[PDB]
Ligand binder design. Structure first.
Ligand SMILES: [Ca+2]
Lengths: 4, 250
């Protein structure tokens, strides 16, 4: 998935 | 052990010479100083796929370092029932030999028996000097969807931008070449072409059953064997295969  | 006699530049060259059985063969790509064992998947129509990655039961830990991912790990079996990573150097030597155009097929299996595919045309893995960067021309189709194009999980607008895989260099927890200020490889426990971090991750943690929670990983990492386009990030696959064949065989 994504990250901050 | 039982390696077959017919050799070639790859598994397609092998099929061209008459080999009709799937198994262990020796191949020596254009720049290989020495031949090496590979598992060829040879179907009836003469198609011979060089298999470079296999997941099927959780027997090998994929959290390996750079040198281990460079050289290969796991075990090759004549029956094709073992998990392994051929090696970044070998994948490089094959996919870039004689500018031959290769297509990559990612084949996935459910915990429910369903198999899905995703093809990439003109697939290549660069040399160590460029950190075994992954590059391909375009997606050629398949029901698994195009996870390598990136995915908008929803979390942010730039998700898609950050979870695409084309042009990404390889990263292991001890060789961080991703686009995240943390270490993706290190926190998801794998070796992969990380961006920030991924929409397709086939070297992730093998979770029995498929479905898994954010808790199964204390720091909430979605680190399973996922392909965002086919299944939810909280679904780890039962089996995965990454193999290559000259593009014209498609
Ligand atoms: Ca980083």
């Amino acid at each position: 998935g994504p990250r901050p | 052990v039982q390696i077959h006699d017919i050799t070639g530049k790859d598994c397609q060259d092998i099929a061209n010479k008459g080999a009709k059985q799937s198994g262990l063969y020796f191949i020596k790509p254009l720049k290989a100083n020495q031949q090496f064992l590979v598992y060829c998947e040879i179907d009836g129509s003469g198609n011979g796929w060089t298999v470079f990655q296999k997941r099927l039961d959780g027997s090998v830990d994929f959290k390996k370092n750079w040198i281990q991912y460079k050289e290969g790990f796991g075990h090759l079996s004549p029956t094709g029932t073992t998990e392994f990573w051929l090696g970044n150097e070998k994948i490089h030597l094959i996919s870039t030999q004689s500018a031959i155009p290769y297509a990559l097929r990612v084949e996935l299996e459910d915990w429910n028996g369903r198999t899905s595919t995703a093809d990439y045309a003109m697939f290549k893995v660069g040399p160590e000097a460029d950190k075994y960067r992954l590059t391909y021309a375009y997606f050629a189709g398949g029901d698994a969807g195009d996870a390598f194009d990136g995915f908008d999980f929803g979390d942010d607008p730039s998700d898609k931008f950050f979870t695409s895989h084309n042009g990404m260099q390889f990263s292991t927890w001890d060789n961080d070449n991703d686009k995240f200020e943390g270490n993706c490889a290190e926190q998801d426990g794998s070796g992969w072409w990380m961006n920030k971090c991924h929409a397709g991750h086939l070297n992730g943690v093998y979770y029995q059953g498929g479905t898994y929670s954010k808790a199964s990983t204390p720091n909430g990492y979605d680190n399973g064997i996922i392909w965002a386009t086919w299944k939810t990030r909280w679904y780890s696959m039962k089996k995965t295969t990454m193999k290559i064949i000259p593009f014209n065989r498609l």
